Amino acid sequence: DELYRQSLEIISRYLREQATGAKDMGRSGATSRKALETLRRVGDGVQRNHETAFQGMLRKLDIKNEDDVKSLSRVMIHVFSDGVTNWGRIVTLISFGAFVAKHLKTINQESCIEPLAESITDVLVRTKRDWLVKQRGWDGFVEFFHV
Amino acid sequence: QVGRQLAIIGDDINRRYDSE
Ligand SMILES: [Zn+2]
């Protein structure tokens, strides 16, 4: 499942880099590198322009431990519950994932960041694989925003 | 509530990049 592997590598690297402040590639490295750079520009913009909403959403989720981190899967599924899929929703979910990741670092729950990245990746790849393939994967992601 | 609020924000982001 290369689409899962590539997606996890991009999403995990972004969440962990956002949480730790320290920038840390396999197959399709050139595309994945542009996707991660696109994610830095667009995702940092999303978190800044919607910071107040994200703060309230984070407080509502009330994440105090690793057990509270097993509820986000149902939240991520809710993003696409109306049947609509687009890159804006996808990048917004990953940006909010990075926002949670920063929170998890602050409360010394850094070990939860990887299961969070695996859960975001699973929802995208498991429930939207057809759409992601039709949109040409992360090449299409990079092209859609064309920063 | 949270996933719906993310969907709304994401649609605004999508419109911003998609509009011709
Ligand atoms: Zn609801």
Side-chain angles (χ1 to χ4, degrees), chain A residues 1-22 24-65 67-147, chain B:
Chain A
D1 194 349
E2 165 76 358
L3 178 55
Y4 180 84
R5 177 215 76 74
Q6 185 190 19
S7 296
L8 180 59
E9 154 161 273
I10 292 168
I11 293 165
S12 168
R13 271 174 196 238
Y14 183 57
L15 270 59
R16 282 187 291 110
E17 173 188 320
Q18 290 273 292
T20 66
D24 161 30
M25 214 88 70
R27 186 218 300 297
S28 314
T31 296
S32 319
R33 265 184 292 139
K34 281 127 92 202
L36 189 55
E37 283 286 10
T38 300
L39 201 46
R40 290 182 181 114
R41 183 93 59 108
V42 176
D44 291 32
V46 172
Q47 298 176 68
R48 263 208 300 308
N49 295 324
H50 300 276
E51 165 137 53
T52 304
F54 276 18
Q55 285 168 357
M57 295 164 16
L58 189 50
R59 283 198 313 280
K60 184 135 137 44
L61 297 169
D62 195 49
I63 313 155
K64 297 167 297 332
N65 55 41
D67 205 335
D68 304 321
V69 185
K70 289 314 177 56
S71 79
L72 298 309
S73 50
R74 82 167 65 98
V75 163
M76 309 165 337
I77 277 298
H78 205 330
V79 172
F80 309 97
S81 61
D82 67 349
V84 172
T85 314
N86 57 55
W87 287 122
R89 289 195 188 188
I90 284 163
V91 76
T92 295
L93 167 59
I94 300 167
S95 301
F96 183 66
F99 198 74
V100 178
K102 293 174 191 160
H103 172 81
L104 291 167
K105 169 71 154 124
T106 302
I107 66 163
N108 199 237
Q109 289 277 25
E110 200 173 328
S111 87
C112 303
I113 295 176
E114 197 62 23
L116 170 65
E118 287 166 305
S119 272
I120 295 174
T121 309
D122 172 78
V123 159
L124 295 177
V125 177
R126 170 166 63 80
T127 80
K128 300 298 173 190
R129 181 186 303 274
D130 283 1
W131 189 92
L132 289 164
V133 171
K134 196 246 181 183
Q135 298 298 312
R136 304 160 49 240
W138 292 99
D139 282 303
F141 176 85
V142 169
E143 287 172 16
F144 177 79
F145 293 105
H146 51 274
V147 305
Chain B
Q1 288 312 310
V2 165
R4 187 49 183 170
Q5 285 303 297
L6 291 171
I8 297 310
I9 293 161
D11 282 351
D12 181 57
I13 305 269
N14 201 73
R15 265 183 310 261
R16 274 218 193 296
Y17 283 88
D18 193 54
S19 296
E20 292 301 329

Short mmCIF file of all heavy atoms in Angstrom, two decimals, chain A residues 22-73, unseen atoms left out:
data_model
loop_
_atom_site.label_atom_id
_atom_site.label_comp_id
_atom_site.label_asym_id
_atom_site.label_seq_id
_atom_site.Cartn_x
_atom_site.Cartn_y
_atom_site.Cartn_z
N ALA A 22 11.42 21.02 15.30
CA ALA A 22 12.66 20.53 14.72
C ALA A 22 12.33 19.77 13.44
O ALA A 22 11.58 18.79 13.48
CB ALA A 22 13.42 19.63 15.70
N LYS A 23 12.87 20.24 12.32
CA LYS A 23 12.58 19.61 11.04
C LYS A 23 13.33 18.30 10.93
O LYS A 23 14.56 18.27 11.00
CB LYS A 23 12.96 20.55 9.89
N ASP A 24 12.65 17.19 10.75
CA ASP A 24 13.35 15.94 10.61
C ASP A 24 13.60 15.68 9.13
O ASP A 24 14.67 15.23 8.75
CB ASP A 24 12.53 14.81 11.19
CG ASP A 24 12.95 13.48 10.68
OD1 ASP A 24 14.14 13.32 10.35
OD2 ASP A 24 12.12 12.57 10.62
N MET A 25 13.59 10.72 2.90
CA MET A 25 12.26 10.38 2.40
C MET A 25 12.38 9.14 1.57
O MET A 25 13.42 8.93 0.97
CB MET A 25 11.66 11.52 1.62
CG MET A 25 10.16 11.60 1.80
SD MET A 25 9.69 12.61 3.20
CE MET A 25 10.16 14.18 2.57
N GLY A 26 11.34 8.31 1.52
CA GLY A 26 11.47 7.06 0.79
C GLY A 26 11.10 7.21 -0.67
O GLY A 26 11.52 8.15 -1.34
N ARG A 27 10.29 6.27 -1.17
CA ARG A 27 9.85 6.30 -2.55
C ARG A 27 8.99 7.53 -2.82
O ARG A 27 8.24 7.98 -1.95
CB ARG A 27 9.08 5.02 -2.89
CG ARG A 27 8.69 4.90 -4.37
CD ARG A 27 7.30 4.30 -4.58
NE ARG A 27 7.16 2.96 -4.03
CZ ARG A 27 7.84 1.89 -4.43
NH1 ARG A 27 8.69 1.95 -5.44
NH2 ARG A 27 7.66 0.73 -3.80
N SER A 28 9.12 8.07 -4.03
CA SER A 28 8.44 9.31 -4.41
C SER A 28 8.87 10.46 -3.50
O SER A 28 8.04 11.20 -2.96
CB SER A 28 6.92 9.15 -4.41
OG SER A 28 6.52 7.95 -5.07
N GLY A 29 10.18 10.60 -3.32
CA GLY A 29 10.69 11.61 -2.41
C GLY A 29 10.48 13.03 -2.92
O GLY A 29 10.19 13.94 -2.14
N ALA A 30 10.63 13.23 -4.23
CA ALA A 30 10.48 14.57 -4.79
C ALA A 30 9.06 15.09 -4.60
O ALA A 30 8.86 16.22 -4.14
CB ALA A 30 10.87 14.57 -6.27
N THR A 31 8.06 14.26 -4.92
CA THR A 31 6.68 14.67 -4.70
C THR A 31 6.40 14.88 -3.22
O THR A 31 5.80 15.89 -2.83
CB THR A 31 5.72 13.65 -5.29
OG1 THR A 31 5.88 13.60 -6.71
CG2 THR A 31 4.28 14.02 -4.99
N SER A 32 6.84 13.95 -2.37
CA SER A 32 6.58 14.07 -0.94
C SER A 32 7.23 15.31 -0.34
O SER A 32 6.66 15.93 0.57
CB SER A 32 7.05 12.81 -0.21
OG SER A 32 6.74 11.65 -0.95
N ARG A 33 8.41 15.69 -0.85
CA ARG A 33 9.08 16.90 -0.39
C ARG A 33 8.28 18.15 -0.73
O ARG A 33 8.20 19.08 0.08
CB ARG A 33 10.47 17.00 -1.02
CG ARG A 33 11.61 16.45 -0.17
CD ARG A 33 12.95 16.69 -0.85
NE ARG A 33 13.10 15.89 -2.06
CZ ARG A 33 13.65 16.33 -3.18
NH1 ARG A 33 14.11 17.57 -3.29
NH2 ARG A 33 13.74 15.51 -4.23
N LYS A 34 7.72 18.21 -1.94
CA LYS A 34 6.89 19.36 -2.30
C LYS A 34 5.58 19.36 -1.52
O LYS A 34 5.07 20.43 -1.15
CB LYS A 34 6.61 19.36 -3.80
CG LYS A 34 7.76 19.88 -4.64
CD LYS A 34 8.15 18.91 -5.74
CE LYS A 34 7.41 19.22 -7.03
NZ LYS A 34 7.35 18.03 -7.93
N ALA A 35 5.02 18.18 -1.26
CA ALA A 35 3.80 18.09 -0.46
C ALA A 35 4.03 18.59 0.96
O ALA A 35 3.19 19.32 1.51
CB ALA A 35 3.27 16.66 -0.45
N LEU A 36 5.15 18.22 1.56
CA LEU A 36 5.45 18.69 2.91
C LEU A 36 5.69 20.19 2.93
O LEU A 36 5.28 20.87 3.88
CB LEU A 36 6.65 17.93 3.48
CG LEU A 36 6.96 18.15 4.96
CD1 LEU A 36 5.73 17.84 5.80
CD2 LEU A 36 8.13 17.28 5.38
N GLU A 37 6.37 20.73 1.91
CA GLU A 37 6.55 22.18 1.84
C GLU A 37 5.22 22.88 1.61
O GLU A 37 4.94 23.92 2.23
CB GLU A 37 7.55 22.54 0.75
CG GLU A 37 9.01 22.30 1.13
CD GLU A 37 9.58 23.32 2.11
OE1 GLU A 37 8.81 24.13 2.67
OE2 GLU A 37 10.81 23.30 2.33
N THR A 38 4.38 22.34 0.72
CA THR A 38 3.04 22.89 0.53
C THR A 38 2.27 22.88 1.84
O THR A 38 1.62 23.87 2.20
CB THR A 38 2.31 22.10 -0.54
OG1 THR A 38 3.04 22.20 -1.78
CG2 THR A 38 0.89 22.63 -0.74
N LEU A 39 2.37 21.78 2.59
CA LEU A 39 1.67 21.64 3.86
C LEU A 39 2.17 22.64 4.89
O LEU A 39 1.38 23.14 5.70
CB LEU A 39 1.86 20.21 4.36
CG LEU A 39 0.91 19.60 5.39
CD1 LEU A 39 -0.54 19.90 5.02
CD2 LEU A 39 1.17 18.10 5.45
N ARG A 40 3.47 22.95 4.87
CA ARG A 40 3.99 23.96 5.79
C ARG A 40 3.40 25.34 5.50
O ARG A 40 2.99 26.05 6.42
CB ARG A 40 5.52 24.02 5.70
CG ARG A 40 6.25 22.82 6.27
CD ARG A 40 7.75 23.04 6.17
NE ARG A 40 8.50 21.90 6.67
CZ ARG A 40 9.28 21.12 5.92
NH1 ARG A 40 9.44 21.35 4.63
NH2 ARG A 40 9.89 20.09 6.49
N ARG A 41 3.37 25.74 4.23
CA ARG A 41 2.83 27.04 3.87
C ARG A 41 1.32 27.10 4.11
O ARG A 41 0.82 28.00 4.79
CB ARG A 41 3.16 27.36 2.42
CG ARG A 41 2.69 28.73 1.98
CD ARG A 41 3.78 29.78 2.17
NE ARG A 41 4.98 29.44 1.41
CZ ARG A 41 5.38 30.07 0.32
NH1 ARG A 41 4.69 31.09 -0.18
NH2 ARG A 41 6.49 29.68 -0.29
N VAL A 42 0.57 26.15 3.54
CA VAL A 42 -0.89 26.20 3.66
C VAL A 42 -1.33 25.90 5.09
O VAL A 42 -2.20 26.58 5.64
CB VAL A 42 -1.54 25.23 2.65
CG1 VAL A 42 -3.05 25.21 2.85
CG2 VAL A 42 -1.22 25.66 1.24
N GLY A 43 -0.75 24.86 5.70
CA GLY A 43 -1.19 24.45 7.02
C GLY A 43 -0.88 25.47 8.10
O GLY A 43 -1.70 25.72 8.99
N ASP A 44 0.31 26.08 8.05
CA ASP A 44 0.62 27.15 8.98
C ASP A 44 -0.34 28.32 8.79
O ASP A 44 -0.75 28.96 9.77
CB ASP A 44 2.07 27.62 8.81
CG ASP A 44 3.09 26.57 9.28
OD1 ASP A 44 2.82 25.35 9.17
OD2 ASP A 44 4.17 26.97 9.75
N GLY A 45 -0.73 28.60 7.55
CA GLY A 45 -1.73 29.63 7.31
C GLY A 45 -3.08 29.27 7.89
O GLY A 45 -3.77 30.12 8.46
N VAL A 46 -3.48 28.00 7.77
CA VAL A 46 -4.78 27.57 8.28
C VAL A 46 -4.82 27.72 9.79
O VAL A 46 -5.80 28.22 10.36
CB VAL A 46 -5.08 26.12 7.87
CG1 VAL A 46 -6.34 25.62 8.58
CG2 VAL A 46 -5.20 26.00 6.36
N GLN A 47 -3.76 27.29 10.48
CA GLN A 47 -3.72 27.36 11.93
C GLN A 47 -3.71 28.79 12.43
O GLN A 47 -4.27 29.08 13.49
CB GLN A 47 -2.50 26.61 12.47
CG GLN A 47 -2.49 25.12 12.14
CD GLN A 47 -1.22 24.45 12.62
OE1 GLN A 47 -0.99 24.33 13.83
NE2 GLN A 47 -0.37 24.02 11.69
N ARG A 48 -3.09 29.70 11.68
CA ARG A 48 -3.04 31.10 12.10
C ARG A 48 -4.37 31.79 11.86
O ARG A 48 -4.86 32.53 12.73
CB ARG A 48 -1.92 31.82 11.34
CG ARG A 48 -0.62 31.93 12.10
CD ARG A 48 0.17 33.17 11.66
NE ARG A 48 0.51 33.15 10.24
CZ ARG A 48 1.11 32.15 9.60
NH1 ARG A 48 1.56 31.09 10.24
NH2 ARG A 48 1.28 32.24 8.28
N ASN A 49 -4.97 31.58 10.69
CA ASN A 49 -6.21 32.28 10.36
C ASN A 49 -7.42 31.74 11.11
O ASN A 49 -8.42 32.45 11.24
CB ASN A 49 -6.44 32.21 8.85
CG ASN A 49 -5.37 32.96 8.07
OD1 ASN A 49 -4.87 34.00 8.52
ND2 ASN A 49 -4.99 32.42 6.92
N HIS A 50 -7.35 30.51 11.61
CA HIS A 50 -8.46 29.90 12.33
C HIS A 50 -8.07 29.50 13.75
O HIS A 50 -8.68 28.62 14.35
CB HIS A 50 -9.00 28.72 11.54
CG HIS A 50 -9.50 29.11 10.18
ND1 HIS A 50 -10.76 29.61 9.97
CD2 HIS A 50 -8.89 29.10 8.97
CE1 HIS A 50 -10.92 29.88 8.68
NE2 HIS A 50 -9.79 29.58 8.06
N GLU A 51 -7.08 30.21 14.30
CA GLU A 51 -6.52 29.85 15.60
C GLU A 51 -7.58 29.85 16.69
O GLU A 51 -7.60 28.94 17.53
CB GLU A 51 -5.38 30.80 15.96
CG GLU A 51 -4.96 30.73 17.43
CD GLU A 51 -3.46 30.73 17.64
OE1 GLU A 51 -2.78 31.63 17.11
OE2 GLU A 51 -2.96 29.83 18.35
N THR A 52 -8.46 30.85 16.71
CA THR A 52 -9.44 30.92 17.79
C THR A 52 -10.41 29.74 17.72
O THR A 52 -10.72 29.13 18.75
CB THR A 52 -10.21 32.24 17.75
OG1 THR A 52 -9.29 33.33 17.82
CG2 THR A 52 -11.12 32.34 18.97
N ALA A 53 -10.92 29.43 16.53
CA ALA A 53 -11.77 28.26 16.36
C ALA A 53 -11.05 26.99 16.79
O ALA A 53 -11.62 26.15 17.49
CB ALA A 53 -12.23 28.15 14.90
N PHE A 54 -9.79 26.82 16.37
CA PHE A 54 -9.03 25.62 16.71
C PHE A 54 -8.86 25.50 18.23
O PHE A 54 -8.93 24.40 18.79
CB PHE A 54 -7.66 25.65 16.02
CG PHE A 54 -7.67 25.15 14.58
CD1 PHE A 54 -8.84 25.05 13.86
CD2 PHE A 54 -6.47 24.79 13.97
CE1 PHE A 54 -8.83 24.59 12.54
CE2 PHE A 54 -6.45 24.34 12.66
CZ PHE A 54 -7.63 24.23 11.94
N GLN A 55 -8.60 26.63 18.90
CA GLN A 55 -8.45 26.62 20.35
C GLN A 55 -9.72 26.09 21.02
O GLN A 55 -9.65 25.25 21.91
CB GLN A 55 -8.14 28.04 20.86
CG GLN A 55 -6.70 28.49 20.60
CD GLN A 55 -6.51 29.98 20.84
OE1 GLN A 55 -7.45 30.71 21.15
NE2 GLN A 55 -5.26 30.44 20.69
N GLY A 56 -10.88 26.59 20.59
CA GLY A 56 -12.12 26.13 21.17
C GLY A 56 -12.40 24.67 20.86
O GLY A 56 -12.83 23.91 21.74
N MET A 57 -12.16 24.25 19.62
CA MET A 57 -12.34 22.85 19.26
C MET A 57 -11.43 21.95 20.09
O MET A 57 -11.86 20.89 20.57
CB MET A 57 -12.09 22.67 17.76
CG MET A 57 -13.11 23.42 16.87
SD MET A 57 -12.56 23.61 15.14
CE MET A 57 -11.29 22.41 15.17
N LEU A 58 -10.17 22.35 20.27
CA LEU A 58 -9.25 21.59 21.10
C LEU A 58 -9.75 21.48 22.54
O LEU A 58 -9.72 20.39 23.14
CB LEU A 58 -7.87 22.23 21.06
CG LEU A 58 -6.71 21.47 21.70
CD1 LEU A 58 -6.66 20.05 21.21
CD2 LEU A 58 -5.39 22.18 21.39
N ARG A 59 -10.22 22.59 23.11
CA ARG A 59 -10.75 22.55 24.48
C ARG A 59 -11.96 21.64 24.56
O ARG A 59 -12.12 20.89 25.54
CB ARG A 59 -11.11 23.96 24.95
CG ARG A 59 -9.90 24.81 25.35
CD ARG A 59 -10.32 26.01 26.21
NE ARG A 59 -11.46 26.73 25.65
CZ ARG A 59 -11.38 27.61 24.66
NH1 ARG A 59 -10.21 27.94 24.12
NH2 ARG A 59 -12.50 28.17 24.19
N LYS A 60 -12.83 21.69 23.55
CA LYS A 60 -14.01 20.83 23.54
C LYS A 60 -13.62 19.36 23.55
O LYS A 60 -14.28 18.54 24.20
CB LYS A 60 -14.87 21.14 22.31
CG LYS A 60 -16.18 20.37 22.24
CD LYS A 60 -17.33 21.30 21.85
CE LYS A 60 -18.27 20.69 20.81
NZ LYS A 60 -18.63 19.26 21.07
N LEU A 61 -12.54 19.00 22.86
CA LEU A 61 -12.14 17.60 22.82
C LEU A 61 -11.60 17.13 24.17
O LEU A 61 -11.66 15.94 24.48
CB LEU A 61 -11.14 17.37 21.69
CG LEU A 61 -11.74 17.67 20.31
CD1 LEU A 61 -10.68 17.70 19.21
CD2 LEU A 61 -12.84 16.68 19.96
N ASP A 62 -11.09 18.06 24.98
CA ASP A 62 -10.65 17.79 26.35
C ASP A 62 -9.66 16.62 26.40
O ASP A 62 -9.92 15.57 26.99
CB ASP A 62 -11.85 17.55 27.27
CG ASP A 62 -11.49 17.64 28.74
OD1 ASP A 62 -10.84 18.62 29.15
OD2 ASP A 62 -11.85 16.72 29.50
N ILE A 63 -8.52 16.83 25.76
CA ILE A 63 -7.48 15.81 25.68
C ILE A 63 -6.54 15.98 26.86
O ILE A 63 -5.76 16.94 26.92
CB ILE A 63 -6.74 15.85 24.35
CG1 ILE A 63 -7.73 15.96 23.20
CG2 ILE A 63 -5.87 14.61 24.20
CD1 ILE A 63 -7.15 16.57 21.95
N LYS A 64 -6.60 15.04 27.80
CA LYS A 64 -5.77 15.03 28.99
C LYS A 64 -4.87 13.81 29.07
O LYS A 64 -4.01 13.76 29.96
CB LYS A 64 -6.64 15.08 30.25
CG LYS A 64 -7.49 16.34 30.40
CD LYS A 64 -8.54 16.17 31.50
CE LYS A 64 -9.55 15.07 31.18
NZ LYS A 64 -9.74 14.84 29.72
N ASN A 65 -5.03 12.82 28.19
CA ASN A 65 -4.26 11.59 28.26
C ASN A 65 -4.33 10.89 26.91
O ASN A 65 -4.94 11.38 25.95
CB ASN A 65 -4.77 10.68 29.38
CG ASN A 65 -6.25 10.38 29.28
OD1 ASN A 65 -6.79 10.16 28.20
ND2 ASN A 65 -6.92 10.38 30.43
N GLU A 66 -3.71 9.70 26.85
CA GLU A 66 -3.73 8.91 25.62
C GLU A 66 -5.11 8.34 25.34
O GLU A 66 -5.47 8.14 24.17
CB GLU A 66 -2.70 7.77 25.73
N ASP A 67 -5.88 8.05 26.39
CA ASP A 67 -7.23 7.53 26.19
C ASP A 67 -8.12 8.55 25.49
O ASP A 67 -8.94 8.19 24.63
CB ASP A 67 -7.82 7.10 27.53
CG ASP A 67 -8.89 6.04 27.38
OD1 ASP A 67 -9.53 5.96 26.31
OD2 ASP A 67 -9.09 5.26 28.34
N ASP A 68 -7.97 9.84 25.83
CA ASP A 68 -8.73 10.87 25.15
C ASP A 68 -8.34 11.02 23.68
O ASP A 68 -9.08 11.65 22.92
CB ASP A 68 -8.57 12.23 25.85
CG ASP A 68 -8.94 12.19 27.32
OD1 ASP A 68 -9.93 11.50 27.68
OD2 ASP A 68 -8.26 12.86 28.13
N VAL A 69 -7.20 10.46 23.26
CA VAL A 69 -6.75 10.58 21.88
C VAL A 69 -7.40 9.55 20.96
O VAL A 69 -7.31 9.67 19.74
CB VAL A 69 -5.21 10.49 21.83
CG1 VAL A 69 -4.67 10.72 20.42
CG2 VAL A 69 -4.59 11.47 22.80
N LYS A 70 -8.08 8.56 21.52
CA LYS A 70 -8.76 7.56 20.71
C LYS A 70 -10.17 7.99 20.30
O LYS A 70 -10.91 7.19 19.72
CB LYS A 70 -8.82 6.23 21.46
CG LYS A 70 -7.46 5.54 21.55
CD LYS A 70 -6.76 5.55 20.20
CE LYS A 70 -5.37 4.93 20.26
NZ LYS A 70 -5.40 3.54 20.79
N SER A 71 -10.55 9.24 20.57
CA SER A 71 -11.83 9.75 20.11
C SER A 71 -11.73 10.57 18.83
O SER A 71 -12.76 10.81 18.19
CB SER A 71 -12.49 10.60 21.20
OG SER A 71 -11.92 11.91 21.25
N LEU A 72 -10.53 10.99 18.42
CA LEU A 72 -10.43 11.86 17.25
C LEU A 72 -10.82 11.15 15.96
O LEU A 72 -11.27 11.81 15.02
CB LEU A 72 -9.03 12.46 17.11
CG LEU A 72 -8.47 13.38 18.20
CD1 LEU A 72 -9.47 14.47 18.50
CD2 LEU A 72 -8.06 12.67 19.46
N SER A 73 -10.66 9.82 15.89
CA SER A 73 -11.05 9.12 14.67
C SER A 73 -12.50 9.42 14.29
O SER A 73 -12.80 9.69 13.12
CB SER A 73 -10.85 7.61 14.84
OG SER A 73 -11.45 7.14 16.03
#
